[PDB]
Design a protein around this ligand. Sequence first.
Ligand code: HEM
Ligand code: HEM
Ligand SMILES: C/C=C(C)/C=C/C=C/[C@H](OC)[C@@H](C)[C@@H](OC)[C@@H](C)CCc1oc2c(O)c(OC)cc(OC)c2c(=O)c1C
Ligand SMILES: CCCCCCO[C@@H]1O[C@H](CO)[C@@H](O)[C@H](O)[C@H]1O
Ligand SMILES: CCCCCCO[C@@H]1O[C@H](CO)[C@@H](O)[C@H](O)[C@H]1O
Ligand SMILES: CCCCCCO[C@@H]1O[C@H](CO)[C@@H](O)[C@H](O)[C@H]1O
Lengths: 42, 73, 85, 89, 99, 365
Amino acid sequence: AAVPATSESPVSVLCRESLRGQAAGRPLVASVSLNVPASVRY
Amino acid sequence: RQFGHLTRVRHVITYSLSPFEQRAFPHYFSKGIPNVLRRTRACILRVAPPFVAFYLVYTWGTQEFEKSKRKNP
Amino acid sequence: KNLLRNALVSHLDGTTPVCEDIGRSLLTYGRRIPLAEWESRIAEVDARVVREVCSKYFYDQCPAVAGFGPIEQLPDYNRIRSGMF
Amino acid sequence: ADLTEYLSRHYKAPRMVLAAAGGLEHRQLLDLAQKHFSGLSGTYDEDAVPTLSPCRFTGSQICHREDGLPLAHVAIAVEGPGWAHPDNV
Amino acid sequence: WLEGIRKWYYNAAGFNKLGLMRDDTIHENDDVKEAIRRLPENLYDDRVFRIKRALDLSMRQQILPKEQWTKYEEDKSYLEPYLKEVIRERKEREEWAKK
Amino acid sequence: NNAFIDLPAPSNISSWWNFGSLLGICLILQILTGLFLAMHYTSDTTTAFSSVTHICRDVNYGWIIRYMHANGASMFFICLYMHVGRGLYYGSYTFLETWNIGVILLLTVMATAFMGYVLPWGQMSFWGATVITNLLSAIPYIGTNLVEWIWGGFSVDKATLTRFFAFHFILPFIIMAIAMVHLLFLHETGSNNPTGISSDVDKIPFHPYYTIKDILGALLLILALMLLVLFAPDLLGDPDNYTPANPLNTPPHIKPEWYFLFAYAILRSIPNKLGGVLALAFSILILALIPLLHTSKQRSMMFRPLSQCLFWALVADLLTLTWIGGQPVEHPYITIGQLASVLYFLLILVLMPTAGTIENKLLKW
Ligand code: HEM
Ligand code: HEM
Ligand SMILES: C/C=C(C)/C=C/C=C/[C@H](OC)[C@@H](C)[C@@H](OC)[C@@H](C)CCc1oc2c(O)c(OC)cc(OC)c2c(=O)c1C
Ligand SMILES: CCCCCCO[C@@H]1O[C@H](CO)[C@@H](O)[C@H](O)[C@H]1O
Ligand SMILES: CCCCCCO[C@@H]1O[C@H](CO)[C@@H](O)[C@H](O)[C@H]1O
Ligand SMILES: CCCCCCO[C@@H]1O[C@H](CO)[C@@H](O)[C@H](O)[C@H]1O
């Protein structure tokens, strides 16, 4: 849509702080859009 | 040969200013003259001698020619 | 204009984004500009206004350029500068 | 010391905004403000008052060539108007 | 002393004034190109920057401050072990082609 | 585009690299003034000289077009010699195809200018046609036959003038096609530069950098050309060509156009027919041998002191031969010319290759 995704795709970590939150905790979800970058949560 | 396919370069940074933000003649004379003098001096020993030789051969041959065309050289 | 309207309203969705809009707006504008005001500002933009404002900031103006990576093909600044007109 | 000097000069009541959004009332927020931020300094003095000068924009270019990276990143921009300008819309 | 004219020559040649090492100035033929291709990352990247710095000085018709000139006694052939082997390999192939 | 606009070019090529575009401009200038002169020129021996005076006296601005063509030919050679000198000094000749085509270009321009000079049918026109075509008579068994065949008779005459107008008319267009091939081979490698070191790590786009530099160069070329046309149109010409051709009399102080003087001095230094012709041919064709005579481990002479000294000796020697070509065949000019002629071949065939080897030794490779 009008809003660009949090991270634009194309085709990091070195500290414990930047690593916290990286571990998965819920089932996976995949999104595809017309106007927004795709995403995969968890 | 096209930009994008010339060669491999890594870790080089280049800083530039827009031509509208800078002078076209910075220290033209203050630094230009010293540089011209330097360049002139650096080459003179390599460029000038052969031409000095030409000059000597030129003046010698011309004089020798005239002298040979008269009664008492 | 329609894209902008949608971006504005969809962004102010949830307490966090709205809280941030409050805090930052008071610092930047000195007040919270309401959606109805943004709407008025958006509604008044037309093709003429877009041409004039774009011309004012982009047209024949010197840009700042940053490149990183395999950029042998990034155009020379003079060429980039001539592309501004 | 650098950190306290910095915080001392910058963290002043007139440069801060306590903001809240959600199921709450402004009156309760304000009372909590008075209750907890009243002692917040409203004066560094007159010798400090950190004030921003305008920042000159320069048409220029910075190129960090690194053919070892797979994709190129390029960012280009002209000088924009500033927060409060109507032109931003 | 030959060696005496050598240091004299080195300075007269003047590639040191542009910050270049002797091997940065070799004429590139196929043997040389193959040798450059075989250089480890650091030697290759250093060569590239010295050549780039030299081309830049040449464009401005300038030279480096004397303290930055490549010093005769410190100039070493980083390319030699590579080029020598490339040539040896080609000679071996040429011998075989004649048999 | 990509043959011009985004053509990659070295960031450091100097003014010595401006002569290629200047040669292109000299060629266009000659073609443009040439066609306009051809609109009023007639090739019959009874009217050739007359038609040229008619151009200069009665055709509107005929005089400026004519002197621009005459002096343009001189500028063409100044640029050609500067262009070749740049190539030798910087080792540009290692681009073999480009270089050899260049040698063909030099010979074709020489042949072209020779024939044009014959067109006004003045005294120099006539004797130049006589002498130069006769170079072919040195060819054993059939030489004389070739000359009469070229002449269309037993002596230079009408048949000669008429075919020379035709040859002079078409050759420049052939030169243009050959020059385009010259550039195509060059584009395969891109340009060499003052350091003789690959410039792939620092290429800049031809436009706007060299387009503006070439324009500045073009302006300087035009200044030099117009200083000659407007202030001294006859300075580089020969008074004897203002005298109609006289088949019964060769002027006593006949001498070649200045740009042919060095070669003429070389030929004149040898008291033998075939020997002189062979030395003449070789003084030009030796350019094709330069690549095979390259001994240095480095491409350019920028970092080679000894080679530079010998290079300027060669230039000074060509200057000597040019001067000698303008002097009578008398003492001590006869001997100075013989030494200069020998020195020319000695510098190219022996001294320069030797300096190259010595320099390699001094650098320990
Ligand atoms: C009608 C005559 C000629 C024309 C129009 C012409 C044109 C050009 C042009 C446009 C260039 C590129 C610009 C430059 O580097 O100068 C060039 C390069 C070159 N030309 Fe010519 N040329 C001519 C004759 C010759 C001759 C007579 C030689 C030498 C015998 C020659 C040898 C070369 C070489 C070796 C290069 C590469 C230069 C380098 O990159 O250093 N050219 N020529
Ligand atoms: C490589 C390009 C050319 C060169 C070097 C060249 C050179 C010359 C020279 C040296 C002369 C003698 C000038 C004089 O003293 O009168 C001449 C004459 C002449 N040229 Fe060319 N020319 C060139 C191209 C052309 C072309 C394309 C034409 C015509 C289509 C042409 C037409 C003439 C005519 C008609 C004359 C006789 C009138 C005169 O002498 O000025 N030329 N040319
Ligand atoms: C149909 C076409 C034909 C036959 C073309 C032939 C082309 C031949 C060569 O060009 C490639 C040739 C022009 C070139 O030789 C390499 C020159 C440097 C030769 C220079 C040359 O000029 C002279 C000249 O101009 C004169 O004028 C009045 C008079 C001359 O002595 C009396 C001479 C002369 O003694 C020589 C050697
Ligand atoms: C040139 C600028 C266009 C004028 C837009 C003003 O717009 C007005 O701003 C008020 C203040 O927040 C709002 O209360 C009101 O609803 C809104 O329409
Ligand atoms: C073209 C002249 C080459 C002569 C060889 C140079 O020889 C060198 O000359 C220097 C300065 O005179 C001396 O300081 C040095 O000791 C000497 O070996
Ligand atoms: C560009 C500087 C050239 C030097 C000027 C002299 O020039 C010479 O003058 C002689 C008679 O005065 C002519 O016969 C000769 O062809 C001409 O080249």
